[PDB]
């Protein structure tokens, strides 16, 4: 029975609006509704795995498991397996696979992070999960962000905390955050973004809406914004939105859109706006397609309407060779020429990089750059031809082209890392002096670039 090279995951994120579910949310799990929805005849074709992200969700673990379990069992005629649950408070998510992934799935890790301070501390914050699916990483993160219109600059501090302080996957890759642990990592949930446009233009957005027309209200998305200004969600992707913003509807219909400022909502309009999101990064070169991106019509206990998106995502087989794993390869080498970081950095002290893969038996310490004043006030450091080659375990290029080296620049004063990126080792050519490029974060803020040329030695 062949390992697959491809995979196809759900992911779901809904605001249930601290209400119990209606009887029947299949149409969620089938992507039908508004927006890019999935074909009818891939409705019985189960996912490979399904994700769900719920907020203010008032079931137990046990309640919520049991509708999932036997929706997608109605769907489907599998019954799914469970790979992961966490709640924080009425966060919460939710990893099912198809029976067949059991043995292929290891490494299972989750946390959460709550958000705020004194006041602020105490229902935000972020739920996650992430686990190996054969020789890819995979991490599924689901947030319930800071409410309110006018509130966009403590979302993306939110967003800011939870990639920093949530610990999933590989603990080895000490330098780096969880924007760049995952081979593929979806990012979803109650985002909490709002349309901003003046409370007396409501009735006219309602009119834009039900001619879904919805290009001048896109346009005023604070998530759009903030991403185009690269405040936050920085080397995110986002699939079009082509479904009406998901809330705030009156509950029991969807024909109304409750904005209207009340006790209940501390005084608060909540104009319709696109709270509930999935965006996704994955590596460098690694296939990944959203194949759906929509809204439920039929699920109405919830102020919010769940948002379904599906994705083919590339995987790859957990390979052995007679050499690695165990040992090097001696037929593979990963050579970094004329390479140099620019660094947005004020500080001088040395610079050292380091290299990160799950290709190599473990990561490999550079000697120090040489620092040089850039023409427009930068830090460039130099590593030129001083690199260490890189011994990857296996030299077989049906693996080592499928790989990608993470690379940290730390401080010698004091290890910390300056900056994180990755490079694909999917080149065009072997044996041949090819341009690589990456740009460098830290805390998911451009903190500069690393580019150079890459010389890859496989066994062909
Ligand atoms: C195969 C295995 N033995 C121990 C842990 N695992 C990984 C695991 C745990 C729970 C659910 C799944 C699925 N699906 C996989």
């Known amino acids: 029975q062949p390992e697959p090279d491809m995979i196809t995951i759900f992911i779901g994120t809904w605001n249930m609006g601290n209400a119990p579910p209606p009887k029947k949310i299949t149409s969620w ?15 019985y074709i189960p996912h490979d795995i399904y994700v769900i992200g719920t907020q203010e ?26 790979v992961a649950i966490h709640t924080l408070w009425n966060i919460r998510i939710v990893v099912l696979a198809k029976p067949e992934h059991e043995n292929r799935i290891s490494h299972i890790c989750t946390d959460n992070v709550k958000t705020g301070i004194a006041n602020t501390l105490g229902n935000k ?40 302080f949530l610990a999933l996957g590989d603990k080895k890759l000490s330098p780096f955050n969880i924007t760049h642990r995952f081979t593929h990592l979806f990012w979803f949930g109650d985002l909490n973004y709002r349309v901003d446009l003046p409370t007396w233009e409501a009735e006219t957005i309602i009119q834009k809406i039900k001619q879904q027309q919805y290009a001048d209200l896109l ?9 185009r200004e690269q405040k936050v969600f920085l080397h995110f992707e986002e699939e079009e939105i082509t479904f009406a913003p998901t809330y705030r509807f009156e509950r029991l219909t969807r024909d109304k859109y409750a904005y209207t400022k009340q006790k209940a909502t501390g ?15 994955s590596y460098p070169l690694v296939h990944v397609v959203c194949q759906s991106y929509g809204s439920t019509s039929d699920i109405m206990t919830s102020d919010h309407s769940p948002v379904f998106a599906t994705f083919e995502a590339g995987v790859t087989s957990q390979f052995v060779s007679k050499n690695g794993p165990g040992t090097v390869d001696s037929q593979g080498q990963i050579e970094f020429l004329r390479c140099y970081a620019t660094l947005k950095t004020k500080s001088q002290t040395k610079f050292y990089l380091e290299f990160h893969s799950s290709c190599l038996e473990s990561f490999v310490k550079s000697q120090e750059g040489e620092n040089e004043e850039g023409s427009e006030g930068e830090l460039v450091v130099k590593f030129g031809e001083t690199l260490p080659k890189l011994k990857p375990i296996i030299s077989d290029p049906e693996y080592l082209l499928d790989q990608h080296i993470l690379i940290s620049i730390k401080s010698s004063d004091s290890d910390e890392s300056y900056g994180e990126g990755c490079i694909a080792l999917r080149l065009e050519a072997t044996e041949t002096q090819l341009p690589i490029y990456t740009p460098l974060t830290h805390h ?9 040329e890459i010389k890859l030695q496989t066994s062909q």
């Open 29 to 43: 799990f089938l992507s039908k509704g508004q927006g890019k929805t999935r074909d009818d005849s891939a409705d």
């Open 219 to 227: 346009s005023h998305d604070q998530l759009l914004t903030e991403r």
């Open 125 to 164: 914050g972020a739920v996650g999960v992430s686990f190996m699916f054969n020789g890819t990483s995979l991490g599924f993160v689901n947030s319930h962000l800071t409410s309110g219109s006018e509130k966009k600059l403590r979302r993306n501090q939110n967003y800011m905390n939870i990639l920093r």
């Open 57 to 82: 969700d008032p079931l137990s673990e046990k309640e919520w498991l049991e509708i999932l379990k036997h929706s997608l069992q109605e769907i489907t005629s599998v019954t799914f397996k469970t």
């Open 267 to 281: 005084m608060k309009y909540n104009l319709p706006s696109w709270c509930d999101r999935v965006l996704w990064k």
């Open 444 to 452: 998911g803020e451009l903190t500069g670039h690393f580019q150079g």
